[PDB]
Structures are given as C-alpha cells and as structure tokens.
Ligand binder design. Structure first.
Ligand SMILES: *[C@@H]1O[C@H](CO)[C@@H](O[C@@H]2O[C@H](CO)[C@@H](O[C@@H]3O[C@H](CO)[C@@H](O)[C@H](O)[C@@H]3O)[C@H](O)[C@H]2NC(C)=O)[C@H](O)[C@H]1NC(C)=O
Ligand SMILES: *[C@@H]1O[C@H](CO)[C@@H](O[C@@H]2O[C@H](CO)[C@@H](O[C@@H]3O[C@H](CO)[C@@H](O)[C@H](O)[C@@H]3O)[C@H](O)[C@H]2NC(C)=O)[C@H](O)[C@H]1NC(C)=O
Ligand SMILES: *[C@@H]1O[C@H](CO)[C@@H](O[C@@H]2O[C@H](CO)[C@@H](O)[C@H](O)[C@H]2NC(C)=O)[C@H](O)[C@H]1NC(C)=O
Ligand SMILES: *[C@@H]1O[C@H](CO)[C@@H](O[C@@H]2O[C@H](CO)[C@@H](O)[C@H](O)[C@H]2NC(C)=O)[C@H](O)[C@H]1NC(C)=O
Ligand SMILES: *[C@@H]1O[C@H](CO)[C@@H](O[C@@H]2O[C@H](CO)[C@@H](O)[C@H](O)[C@H]2NC(C)=O)[C@H](O)[C@H]1NC(C)=O
Ligand SMILES: *[C@@H]1O[C@H](CO)[C@@H](O[C@@H]2O[C@H](CO)[C@@H](O)[C@H](O)[C@H]2NC(C)=O)[C@H](O)[C@H]1NC(C)=O
Ligand SMILES: *[C@@H]1O[C@H](CO)[C@@H](O[C@@H]2O[C@H](CO)[C@@H](O)[C@H](O)[C@H]2NC(C)=O)[C@H](O)[C@H]1NC(C)=O
Ligand SMILES: *[C@@H]1O[C@H](CO)[C@@H](O)[C@H](O)[C@H]1NC(C)=O
Ligand SMILES: *[C@@H]1O[C@H](CO)[C@@H](O)[C@H](O)[C@H]1NC(C)=O
Ligand SMILES: *[C@@H]1O[C@H](CO)[C@@H](O)[C@H](O)[C@H]1NC(C)=O
Ligand SMILES: *[C@@H]1O[C@H](CO)[C@@H](O)[C@H](O)[C@H]1NC(C)=O
Ligand SMILES: *[C@@H]1O[C@H](CO)[C@@H](O)[C@H](O)[C@H]1NC(C)=O
Ligand SMILES: *[C@@H]1O[C@H](CO)[C@@H](O)[C@H](O)[C@H]1NC(C)=O
Ligand SMILES: *[C@@H]1O[C@H](CO)[C@@H](O)[C@H](O)[C@H]1NC(C)=O
Ligand SMILES: *[C@@H]1O[C@H](CO)[C@@H](O)[C@H](O)[C@H]1NC(C)=O
Ligand SMILES: *[C@@H]1O[C@H](CO)[C@@H](O)[C@H](O)[C@H]1NC(C)=O
Ligand SMILES: *[C@@H]1O[C@H](CO)[C@@H](O)[C@H](O)[C@H]1NC(C)=O
Ligand SMILES: *[C@@H]1O[C@H](CO)[C@@H](O)[C@H](O)[C@H]1NC(C)=O
Ligand SMILES: *[C@@H]1O[C@H](CO)[C@@H](O)[C@H](O)[C@H]1NC(C)=O
Lengths: 98, 49, 98, 148, 49, 50, 49, 50, 49, 49
C-alpha cells in the first residue's frame, strides 16, 4: 500500500487491500532460573529518523488597516468596538513573543 | 480486530522470559524476576507469592 | 498614504520604531539599516545588552538594535575508559533555578 | 477565525517543542535507557540537524542479529548449607563445557567468576549448583580454602 | 480579556432596530418585532461560540 | 568494525531516501519508513502554513 | 539543505517581507508588499539559519 | 490522525499465542485476555472488560 | 465553527496519544522506576485493554 | 550482624565484598579489630596474623 486510512489501503496500481499490523519482536525480561537462556551475541547498527516541529512563523496584523483599509472616518466607527481590536491584536502579539 | 491483536500481544509478553525456544517459565518466576529489579531477592523459599 | 510602523516600548517609555523609510521619524535622531526594515532610535550603540528580543534581533536599554548571540554553556562528556590524563570535578557550588 | 487558527497551532508547536528539548537533553547530550524514547532498540548516541521550522533527529541504536544458548544456573549451594546468588540481577551464571562463566543478560560479555560476583544468603534452593568447599576451585578459580 | 470581549458584544445592534430586546417590543408590533429580535439571538449565540 | 560499517551503510540510505531518487525501494525496510514519515510531516509544515 | 530544497519552494505563502522595498515602490508591489498594505506583517523567523 | 494510530498498532504472533489463562497460573487474568473467536473469520474479539 | 471544534479536539487527542505511547513502552513493555508514572508506588507490571 | 536493602527487607550475610575501604573513621562506626572481625563477616579469616 502507498496510501492508507484505517484498515483500508491502496497499492500502486490502484488495488484496494486490507492492512496488516507491522510485525515486530517484543523484548523479554530474562528470568532467574536454572534453565537454557538465549542472550544477544552478534550486533548490528541502525539509524532511525524522527522529525519535530519547534517553531511556527509568527504573523501579526494591524486591526485598523485590515478592517478600514486606511479610511479616516471608518476608524471612528471601529473605535466603538472597544474590546474587539485589543483581543485580536494582543492574542497574536503575546504568542509571538513567548 | 487490530485492537484485540494489539492488547493481546502486550498482555502475553509478560510470560516471556528469554528462554530457549521461547518456552514460558511459570508465572511465579516472571513476578520474581520483576521483584529482583526492585531489590536483590534473598527469600529463596518464596513464601510471599 | 500611511502604512503601519511598529513602536518599541520598554519600562513605559518609547525607545525605538521599526520603519520602512529613510527618515528620523517620531523624534529619534539615529537611523540604522536592517536586512528588511529601517530602524530609528536614540541609541548610542555603546551597548551590548538585550532587554527585549525577537528572532535574532534585540534592543538595549537606550533602544539600540543588536543581534542576540546564543548563550554560552559547557556540555558534559562521557568520561572514557582509557589510560590517559583525565579531569574530574573536585570543587562544588550550589545553584538555584526557577 | 484567523486568531483561532494561530492559537491552535501554537498549542501543537509548544507541545512538540518540549519533546524536542527533552530529546536534546536525554538522547543527544545523554544516553537513555527509557524504552522507545530515543528509538526502537538499544540507544547509543543521537544526532540533530535543522529542518523547516523544526529539528530532525538521527537516533543511532543497536538491534540484535544472533543469539547464543547457555545453560544458566540460578545460584550456588556449598556443602548444602550455604547459598550464593549473583550480586547483580542482570548477571547470569552459565556452564561452558567443563567450567563456569558469568555473563550479562543484555549483552554477551563473558566474565571469569570472581568471589565478589556473589552474595551470600541464608538458605539453599536444591536447584542451585551442588558442590563442596574442596571443589569451589572449579567454579571460582581464585578461591583457595585457607581455613581448611 | 475573554470576559470583556463577551460583555461588550451585548451592545451590538447586529443591524436590528435596537440593542435592547425590550425596546424593540416597545416600538413595534409582535409580528414585526420577532423578525427584529431574531438578529440579536443569532448574533449573541455567535458571541458565545 | 561491523558497528562502523553498518552505520555507514545506513547513513547513506538516509540521504538517498531524503532525495527520493530510490523511490521504488524506499519502502524496503522500517528504517527507511521513518524517513518517509519524516518527509510526510516536513511536506505538511511547508504546504499548510501559508 | 536537501531538507530545505527537496520540499516545495513556497515563496508565495509565508515570507517575511522587505518593508523598506515596498513603500518606495519603484516597481509594482509584490505579493509580500500587498499583504503589508493590508496590515498583515510577516516577521522574520526565529530559527535563524 | 490515521497514520499516528497505524504506526502505534504493532503485532507479534510469538507473544500473542501466550495471551492465555494458563500462562499466568495463580494470577487470574481471565477478564483481560482476548476472547476466542465464536465463529472464526477473525483473529480475536473483545475481552471480558473491553 | 465545526472545523474549529475538530482541530481543537485533535490537539488534545494527540497529546493523550503521545502519553499513551510513552506508558505502553515504559509501563507495559518495561518496568518503570520513574515515581508516579505507572501508579503511585513500586511498579511491577501493567496491563492494557 | 546482617545487611539488608533499604527499599525492601531482604536479609543478607555480610561478605567482605559488600564493603568499600576508605581513608578515615567516623566517630559512629562499629569499633572492631582484625582478629575478631569474623563476628561481623563470618567467612573472613585473617590470613596475615
Ligand atoms: C548550566 O547553566 C549555568 C548557567 O548558570 C552554566 O554555568 C555558566 O556557564 C558559562 C559558560 O560556560 C560560564 O562562563 C564561563 O566562565 C569562565 C570564568 O569566567 C570563563 O573562563 C569561560 O570562558 C566562560 O565565560 C559561567 O561561569 C558558568 N557559571 C555559572 C555559575 O553559572 C553552565 O555552563 C550550564 N551547564 C550545563 C552543563 O548546561
Ligand atoms: C477467574 O476469574 C473468573 C472471572 O473472570 C472466574 O470465572 C467466574 O467464576 C464464577 C465462580 O465459578 C462463576 O460464577 C458461577 O459459576 C457456576 C458455574 O457456572 C454457576 O453455577 C454459578 O451460578 C455462577 O455463575 C462465573 O460465572 C465465572 N465467570 C466467567 C466469566 O467465567 C474464574 O472462576 C476464576 N478462576 C480462578 C482459577 O480463579
Ligand atoms: C525494532 O525495529 C526493527 C526493524 O528495524 C524490528 O525488527 C524486525 O522485526 C520483524 C519481526 O517480524 C522481523 O521480521 C524483521 O526482519 C526485523 N527487521 C529488522 C531490520 O530488524 C524490531 O522487531 C523492532 N523492535 C525491537 C524490540 O527490536
Ligand atoms: C527455587 O527457584 C526456582 C526458580 O528459580 C523455583 O522453580 C519453580 O518455582 C515454583 C514456585 O515459584 C515451583 O512451583 C516450581 O515447581 C519450580 N519449577 C520447577 C520446574 O519445578 C523453585 O521451586 C524454587 N524453590 C522453591 C522451594 O519454591
Ligand atoms: C543438591 O543436593 C541436595 C541434597 O542432597 C538435593 O536435595 C535433595 O534432592 C533429592 C532429589 O534429588 C530429594 O529427594 C531430597 O528430598 C532433596 N533434599 C532435601 C533436603 O529436600 C538436591 O536435589 C541436589 N541438587 C542438585 C542440582 O544436584
Ligand atoms: C560522623 O560523625 C559526625 C560527628 O563528627 C556525626 O554527627 C553527629 O551526629 C550525632 C547524631 O546523634 C549528633 O548528636 C552530633 O551532634 C553530630 N555532630 C556533628 C558535629 O554534626 C555524623 O552523624 C557521623 N556520620 C556518619 C555518616 O555516620
Ligand atoms: C570507637 O573508638 C573511638 C576511639 O577510641 C571512640 O571515640 C572516642 O570517644 C570518646 C567518648 O568519650 C571521646 O572522648 C574520644 O575523643 C573519642 N576518640 C576520638 C579519637 O575521637 C568512639 O566513641 C568509639 N565508637 C564506638 C561506636 O564504639
Ligand atoms: C505478520 O506476520 C503474520 C504471521 O502470521 C503474517 O500472516 C502477516 O502477513 C505479517 N504481516 C506483515 C505486514 O509483515
Ligand atoms: C539445555 O540444553 C542442553 C544441551 O546444551 C540440553 O541437554 C537440555 O535438555 C536443554 N534444556 C534444558 C531444559 O535443560
Ligand atoms: C557478527 O555480525 C556480522 C554481520 O555482518 C558478521 O559478519 C559476523 O561474522 C558476526 N559474528 C561475529 C562472531 O562477529
Ligand atoms: C538613509 O539615509 C541616510 C541619510 O539620512 C543615508 O546616509 C543612508 O545612506 C540612507 N540609507 C539607505 C539604505 O537608503
Ligand atoms: C531623542 O534624541 C533627540 C536628540 O535631538 C531629542 O531631541 C529627543 O528629545 C530624544 N527623545 C525622543 C523620545 O525622541
Ligand atoms: C562603550 O562602553 C564601555 C563600557 O562602559 C566603555 O569602556 C567604552 O569606552 C565605550 N565606548 C566605546 C566607543 O566602545
Ligand atoms: C560565548 O563565547 C564566544 C567566544 O567563545 C563569545 O564570542 C560570545 O560573546 C560568548 N557569548 C555571549 C552571549 O556573550
Ligand atoms: C599525564 O600527564 C602528565 C603531564 O601532562 C604526563 O607526565 C604523564 O606522562 C601523562 N600520562 C599519560 C598516561 O598520558
Ligand atoms: C573548594 O573551594 C573553596 C573556595 O571556594 C575552598 O575553600 C575549599 O577548600 C575547596 N575544597 C577543597 C576540598 O579543597
Ligand atoms: C487457551 O489455550 C487453550 C489451549 O491452547 C485453548 O483451548 C484456549 O482456547 C486458549 N484461549 C485463549 C483465549 O487463548
Ligand atoms: C575455621 O574452621 C573452624 C572449624 O570449623 C572454626 O572453628 C573457625 O571458626 C573457622 N574460622 C574461620 C575464620 O573461618
Ligand atoms: C602482614 O601484616 C604485617 C603487620 O606487621 C606486615 O608486617 C606485613 O607486611 C603484612 N603482610 C604483607 C604480605 O604485606
């Protein structure tokens, strides 16, 4: 399968197929007993890759220019929305700085 | 289906003891091995099980 | 006619202004170029401290924009098993971190 | 609606950034024994490189290829009245032909039995190795009974 | 800030005739005032959302 | 010697899997599957943030 | 550098604009400048190369 | 969301076959082991708690 | 609004899955000595369903 | 005398390998001479004296 969702996958030519869980070998805690035990003897090295996002490009907007497009008299209607711009513009500013 | 095969595999792993041919030890020794990992056991007559 | 600038405030005073233009706006008497914006302030540039920071930039107490250097540490090491001169900690001090 | 998008994404990146700091401290600088934290397998060392808006880790781990079968014994009993177990629970005493050796359970690292490898306990189990003080020289080569 | 944003939404007309529900019924007849109050209901449910 | 040689073996396949020029064989093992999974998130963070 | 070019060169999405280029406008404004005229400011990334 | 779960759900026959009431002796784990398929056509069902 | 609920729900579920994967590896497949991570006391073994 | 783990009471007969030799005595150590040390370590035979 190249694309998967839930138990359904599709291979290259487009055939749908059910997916099997990946086979692994669980480790076992070696017991203290007079018996025959198996111990790792012959070792090989492998490299496994993992990606983690640590930042997101922050964006700040001016609540006045976006809404009123710089119109002079529109500003004196938006200012009656007293708590609107501060909520939008502090929520973006503080997240970027932190 | 997959969950019953997932939790089922995890449950049965406790019976594994690293033996030859993966023959399962009696489960008292799986507990005893896990007690040794806390402190080195000296009760050899094994009354506390 | 009036694109948005960004002002810099520290300890209830205004110390700088990020600008898109070659002027000494808002009364600041010193202008400096940055890769993507002009910057105006009364900074003396006799300074190396950062009280505010964003990305790789920062400002002094007088408003001088400076690049924030990564902070300095000494990584620990895995003391190897070898016939050689090793160094081992000998004196200890106590530190409290919040 | 736009602010709702940003705060939700900052929640994720903040949670993933903490995990990256943990993996720098516990997989890159240090060597970890937490299972699966620094990769499936036995951890040795890790590397980190820059990636778009994040980091990429290259966990170098060991995976076993072959196993060895060894006749392990739970402990020792001398004269039938004195019992010995191994000083570390991660060690195992095993017979190799006509002599005894001591090996670790995580990796096969053979060890000549020293008397300090054992811990004396106050009972025997019958399933221990069954020897006398005149014969402990065949299990612990350095042992020589001086009182006798 | 969230509470102040929520309490400020109560002065919104939402382009109804007035921001006071009682003032609508003091000005208009019931068959016409319902179509005016509905704007305040929908708008303030958006504020809570 | 085997630990060093095997590390060099894997470290080269990682580069080939990042570029994707070994596409028909990238699925051959779990070690290269983690590279595909990494490319799946690095794809998303680049195509979604805009 | 492979993990920075193997992926799509999304220069038409998030890009920290050159604000000093926009307002002089010797040429018609770019996409990054057009967003700046609407109050949208993309700051330079904190993950400095 | 599907890829995260699919990578997590791993399987192992060598250990699944030991998920049984006999493998635990005096420790009664019968309420958690997978149920035997009533009519075949699936590997296992819910346990007495699932 | 619906997309907002779904995205906010997947954020909590992803964090809860990450903790679950940690506890499967450290409490189920292994025996933990991290205090308070697999019970308040001396962990022995764990089961999952 | 006996030796036990602090986590769990597991009694142990003191072998000489259980100890580590240091340069100085604290005013609180057990006050003993080489000849009669066998009362603390049963298997210790003084092979000098
Ligand atoms: C843990 O965090 C502390 C920070 O409080 C780090 O300690 C400090 O690290 C710096 C950088 O190594 C030390 O500066 C050095 O000072 C000497 C003497 O002036 C100088 O010769 C060096 O070139 C460098 O400037 C600083 O003295 C040191 N001390 C204190 C008391 O904080 C520490 O490095 C961090 N450790 C780890 C392992 O992360
Ligand atoms: C291990 O635990 C299971 C429960 O998970 C025990 O099975 C339960 O045992 C009781 C006692 O026998 C059963 O109830 C009684 O069974 C008899 C015989 O059918 C019946 O005459 C009574 O009316 C009553 O139903 C109970 O049904 C049974 N439950 C299940 C799900 O099997 C089991 O006995 C325990 N075994 C050991 C060895 O500890
Ligand atoms: C760790 O990952 C490796 C894969 O790199 C798993 O090993 C595979 O296990 C299956 C089990 O059916 C075998 O068929 C494969 O041949 C193994 N391949 C390799 C390349 O190792 C392993 O099971 C995982 N877990 C542990 C604990 O090692
Ligand atoms: C001595 O230790 C071994 C384990 O290392 C015990 O072996 C099994 O232990 C259980 C009790 O926990 C017994 O029921 C089994 O009969 C033992 N196994 C076999 C194959 O017989 C051994 O019994 C311990 N001694 C005592 C007295 O319990
Ligand atoms: C070690 O010696 C002891 C003592 O002779 C053995 O314990 C006896 O074992 C027989 C069976 O072999 C039992 O009938 C006796 O009842 C056991 N004695 C006691 C006191 O219970 C022990 O089996 C020997 N073990 C080995 C591995 O040789
Ligand atoms: C080693 O000796 C010091 C004294 O040099 C011990 O400290 C004394 O402990 C007793 C405990 O009852 C107190 O009454 C004394 O007042 C303590 N004296 C001082 C100067 O602190 C210490 O406990 C001993 N240490 C060890 C590890 O045994
Ligand atoms: C072990 O012996 C030492 C030395 O004889 C004892 O330490 C002396 O204790 C007396 C108590 O009156 C003091 O006056 C001396 O000054 C101590 N001597 C030294 C050198 O400090 C110690 O008390 C004895 N401890 C035990 C546990 O028997
Ligand atoms: C896993 O192993 C089982 C053994 O019965 C096999 O049937 C199944 O096809 C294997 N699946 C994968 C994906 O390796
Ligand atoms: C252990 O292996 C030996 C051969 O090395 C064999 O004789 C014995 O039967 C095996 N198993 C047990 C349980 O002793
Ligand atoms: C160990 O593994 C490598 C794998 O290539 C193999 O060449 C070597 O012969 C194996 N055995 C020993 C004893 O080193
Ligand atoms: C900005 O203007 C000053 C004079 O005010 C001039 O010296 C400087 O070269 C100008 N810089 C740019 C980058 O246009
Ligand atoms: C900045 O410095 C100039 C120097 O002429 C001075 O006039 C002005 O008052 C200072 N402060 C501010 C806030 O502009
Ligand atoms: C800058 O500050 C330092 C410390 O106060 C001082 O020694 C130095 O003379 C100042 N001036 C210049 C030009 O570096
Ligand atoms: C860290 O050390 C370097 C030289 O090794 C130095 O240039 C730099 O100024 C130091 N860092 C800080 C934050 O001052
Ligand atoms: C350790 O260092 C000292 C002084 O540098 C030198 O005399 C001595 O030979 C060194 N020993 C070794 C084993 O490197
Ligand atoms: C450790 O350093 C202090 C000074 O800070 C010194 O007085 C003390 O003697 C030192 N410790 C030792 C064991 O020499
Ligand atoms: C337990 O094992 C016995 C024998 O193999 C079998 O009859 C029973 O169905 C098994 N049950 C489960 C749940 O594995
Ligand atoms: C030596 O053996 C004899 C006889 O068992 C006993 O009296 C004496 O205490 C032993 N001494 C030592 C130090 O083992
Ligand atoms: C034994 O102790 C005595 C104490 O007087 C000393 O002379 C002798 O050197 C010691 N034995 C050895 C082998 O050093």
């Amino acid at each position: 399968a190249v694309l998967t969702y839930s138990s359904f996958g599709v291979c290259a030519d487009g055939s749908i197929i059910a997916v099997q869980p990946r086979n692994v070998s669980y480790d076992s805690v070696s017991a203290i007993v007079t018996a025959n035990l198996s111990i790792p003897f012959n070792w090989t090295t492998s490299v496994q890759v993992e990606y983690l996002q640590i930042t997101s490009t922050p964006i700040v907007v001016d609540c006045s220019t976006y809404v009123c497009n710089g119109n002079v008299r529109c500003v004196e209607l938006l200012k009656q929305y007293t708590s609107a711009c501060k909520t939008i513009e502090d929520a973006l500013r503080n997240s970027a700085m932190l | 289906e997959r969950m019953a095969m997932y939790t089922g595999s995890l449950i049965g792993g406790i019976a594994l003891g690293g033996l030859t041919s993966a023959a399962s030890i009696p489960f008292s020794l799986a507990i005893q091995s896990r007690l040794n990992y806390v402190a080195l056991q000296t009760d050899v007559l094994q009354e506390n099980q | 006619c009036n694109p948005p600038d960004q002002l810099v405030v520290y300890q209830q005073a205004v110390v700088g202004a990020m600008l898109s233009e070659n002027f000494t706006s808002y009364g600041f008497s010193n202008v400096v170029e940055m890769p993507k914006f002009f910057y105006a302030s009364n900074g003396t540039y006799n300074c190396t401290d950062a009280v505010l920071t964003y990305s790789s930039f920062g400002v002094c107490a007088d408003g001088s924009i400076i690049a924030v250097q990564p902070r300095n540490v000494s990584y620990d090491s895995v003391s190897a098993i070898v016939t050689a001169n090793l160094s081992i900690p000998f004196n200890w001090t106590t530190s409290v971190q919040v | 609606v736009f602010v709702s998008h940003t705060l939700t994404k900052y929640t994720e990146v903040r949670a993933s950034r903490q995990l990256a700091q943990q993996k720098v401290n516990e997989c890159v600088k240090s060597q970890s024994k937490r299972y699966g934290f620094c990769g499936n397998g036995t951890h040795i060392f890790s590397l980190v490189n820059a990636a778009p808006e994040g980091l990429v880790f290259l966990h170098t781990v060991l995976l076993p290829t072959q196993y060895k079968d060894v006749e392990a014994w739970s402990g020792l009993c001398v004269d039938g009245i004195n019992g010995y177990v191994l000083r570390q629970p991660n060690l195992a005493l095993y017979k190799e032909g006509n002599y005894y050796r001591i090996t670790s359970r995580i990796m096969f690292e053979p060890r000549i039995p020293t008397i300090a490898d054992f811990v004396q306990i106050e009972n025997c189990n019958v399933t221990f190795v069954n020897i006398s003080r005149s014969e402990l020289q065949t299990i612990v080569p350095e042992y020589i009974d001086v009182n006798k | 800030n969230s509470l102040n944003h929520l309490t400020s939404q109560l002065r919104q007309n939402f382009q109804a005739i007035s921001s006071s529900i009682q003032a609508i019924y003091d000005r208009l007849d019931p068959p016409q005032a319902d179509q005016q109050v509905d704007r305040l209901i929908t708008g303030r449910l958006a504020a809570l959302n | 010697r085997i630990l060093a040689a095997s590390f060099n073996k894997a470290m080269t396949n990682i580069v080939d899997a990042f570029t994707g020029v070994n596409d028909a064989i990238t699925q051959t093992s779990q070690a290269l599957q983690t590279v595909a999974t990494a490319l799946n998130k690095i794809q998303d963070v680049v195509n979604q943030q805009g | 550098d492979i993990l920075f070019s193997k992926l799509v060169t999304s220069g038409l999405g998030t890009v920290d604009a050159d604000y000093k280029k926009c307002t002089k406008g010797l040429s018609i404004a770019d996409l990054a400048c057009a967003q700046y005229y609407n109050g949208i400011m993309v700051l330079p990334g904190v993950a400095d190369a | 969301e599907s890829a995260d779960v699919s990578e997590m759900l791993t399987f192992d026959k060598k250990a699944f076959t030991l998920a049984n009431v006999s493998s635990f002796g005096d420790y009664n784990l019968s309420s958690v082991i997978p149920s035997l398929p009533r009519s075949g056509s699936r590997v296992a069902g819910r346990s007495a708690i699932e």
